[PDB]
Write a protein that binds this ligand. Sequence first.
Ligand SMILES: *Cc1c(C)c(=O)n2c(=O)c(C)c(C)n12
Ligand SMILES: [Cl-]
Ligand SMILES: [Cl-]
Ligand SMILES: [Cl-]
Ligand SMILES: [Cl-]
Ligand SMILES: [Cl-]
Ligand SMILES: [Mg+2]
Ligand SMILES: [Mg+2]
Ligand SMILES: [Mg+2]
Ligand code: NI
Ligand code: NI
Length: 310
Amino acid sequence: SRKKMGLLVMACGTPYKEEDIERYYTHIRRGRKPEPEMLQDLKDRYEAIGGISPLAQITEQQAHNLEQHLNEIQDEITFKAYIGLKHIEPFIEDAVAEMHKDGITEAVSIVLAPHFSTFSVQSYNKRAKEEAEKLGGLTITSVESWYDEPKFVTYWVDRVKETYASMPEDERENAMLIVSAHSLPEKIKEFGDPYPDQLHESAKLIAEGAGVSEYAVGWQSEGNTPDPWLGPDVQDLTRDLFEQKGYQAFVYVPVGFVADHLEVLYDNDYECKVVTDDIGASYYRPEMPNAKPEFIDALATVVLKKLGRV
Ligand SMILES: *Cc1c(C)c(=O)n2c(=O)c(C)c(C)n12
Ligand SMILES: [Cl-]
Ligand SMILES: [Cl-]
Ligand SMILES: [Cl-]
Ligand SMILES: [Cl-]
Ligand SMILES: [Cl-]
Ligand SMILES: [Mg+2]
Ligand SMILES: [Mg+2]
Ligand SMILES: [Mg+2]
Ligand code: NI
Ligand code: NI
């Protein structure tokens, strides 16, 4: 009756407990174990943002709710979700091997990052497809980007509108919206990587839908290699825009991220908040989509559009 398909949901991964910080960051650092002071600092950061455990549940909740919602809203396909992570188990290759073992022959994949880049999305999709080729008997159709799905734009538009509506009059008249994603090396431009263009278009679409005429695009969370990374960084951008025009409120939409993790709860809600507190501006950062129903319905529409079924 219903056609069976795998639903491969890919994400960065998180530690599952404090004793996973060493192995998770060693993998991010390409085999270089963090020094003891860095391990201690990371433990402190996770404690300050409320703990690791809640963060580690979000991708699983996203994948489970997406599977169930997709199976309810149409009658042709029965999806089974499999989670594949970049930096901790279950890895991408573990998920594809499990699909193969379970008898899946046809799958659709989606990365829980809305903008395509050559560093992340393309690498996830290539890893998944290479593992399927090695095992045989299984093919994967991969979503490449989805930042322009109207239901996803509307998620952020409605959160921005609520934040502006909640402001005092003086803030509402002297506010700045900063839309951001995770920085990458500038060298991606040598490949024509559309990641920067897609961030700028996300920003255009969200500001336009919310009616916000004053906005800026920034980057966050750059690494420390000697080569230049995409900027400006959100901390510098905030201070610069303040020094130019004296905004009384900054609103942060880190549209490249879809789930609470350190790079939002720390790199925005601590590091950007340090800057806004220092300059006397109010700080707002609306909620990440996490596994909320409005977001799950946007993802389900992305998948069904990719398969040509809506
Ligand atoms: C890979 C990744 C994403 C998407 C994210 O939000 N975070 C973090 O907060 C860390 C520490 C890492 C890695 N990631
Ligand atoms: Cl791809
Ligand atoms: Cl696509
Ligand atoms: Cl794309
Ligand atoms: Cl919100
Ligand atoms: Cl919702
Ligand atoms: Mg313990
Ligand atoms: Mg597209
Ligand atoms: Mg940093
Ligand atoms: Ni720009
Ligand atoms: Ni990072």
